[PDB]
């Protein structure tokens, strides 16, 4: 239940090995986590969803984007958490694109929008 206990168990699962077997990996992850414990950018799921849809279109997955938007509507209807933005950011960072070949154009955040920090 402790954040450290959760980290140890998650490292064991990610490595498929013991926590002591991931102790060095666990140590690196612990260093990374204690480096920053809170997000430096606020939670505004409108922009997060906009980025998700933009990525889906960049993946030529407009139908999948519509399915995702409908899922977002259903999930916000089943809202049970208050900081979903972080979970959404995690899902976007965990997202992979086997549906498209690897080639992308760089976006902007200062010509485009940069997250005003929280």
């Amino acid at each position: 239940k402790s954040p450290n206990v959760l980290l140890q168990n998650l490292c064991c699962r990610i490595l498929g090995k013991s926590e002591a077997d991931v102790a060095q990996q666990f140590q690196y992850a612990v260093r990374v986590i204690g480096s920053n414990f809170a997000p430096t950018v606020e939670r505004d799921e409108f922009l997060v969803a906009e980025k998700i849809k933009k990525e889906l279109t960049r993946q030529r997955r407009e139908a999948d984007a519509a399915l995702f938007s409908e899922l977002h509507r259903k999930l916000h209807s089943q809202g049970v958490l208050k900081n979903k933005w972080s979970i959404l950011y995690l899902l976007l960072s965990l997202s992979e694109d086997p549906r498209k070949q690897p080639s992308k154009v760089s976006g902007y955040a200062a010509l485009f929008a940069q997250a005003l920090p929280r």
Partner: protein, 129 residues
């Protein structure tokens, strides 16, 4: 507000210019320019909406907006300068590409403007290419 007004004036000019260069008689080149500008305008409007979300949070200041509008002001200035150049030069085609290379050498040195113009130039020369 007058200082902020510059970016909004750029927004209005961009709306007008993306409408004007949207015509097929303005060319598919001008159409692509307006489409890329529309993507950028979508980014700007999304930023505006996020700021409006902060205003619904009641947590925005003229400094905060202006500071948040500072990079936005710079981006809008770059885009609006490009639009004003395209309209005043009426470039359509190889002249447009030549002006693109010229203005890219002129916006060289500023990495934000240089990178945005590089993306726009690649996208716009894709059709002529």
């Amino acid at each position: 507000v007058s200082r902020i007004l510059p970016v909004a004036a750029s927004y209005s000019t961009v709306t007008r210019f993306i409408e004007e260069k949207s015509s097929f008689e303005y060319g598919q080149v001008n159409h692509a320019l307006a489409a890329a500008m529309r993507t950028l305008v979508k980014e700007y409007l999304v930023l505006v909406t996020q700021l409006e979300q902060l205003q619904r949070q009641g947590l925005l200041s003229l400094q905060k907006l202006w500071f948040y509008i500072q990079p936005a002001m710079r981006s809008l200035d770059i885009l609006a300068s490009l639009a004003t150049s395209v309209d005043k030069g009426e470039c359509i085609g190889g002249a447009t590409l030549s002006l693109l290379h010229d203005r890219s050498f002129s916006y060289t040195g500023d990495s934000q403007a240089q990178e945005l113009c590089l993306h726009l130039t690649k996208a716009a020369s894709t059709p002529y290419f």
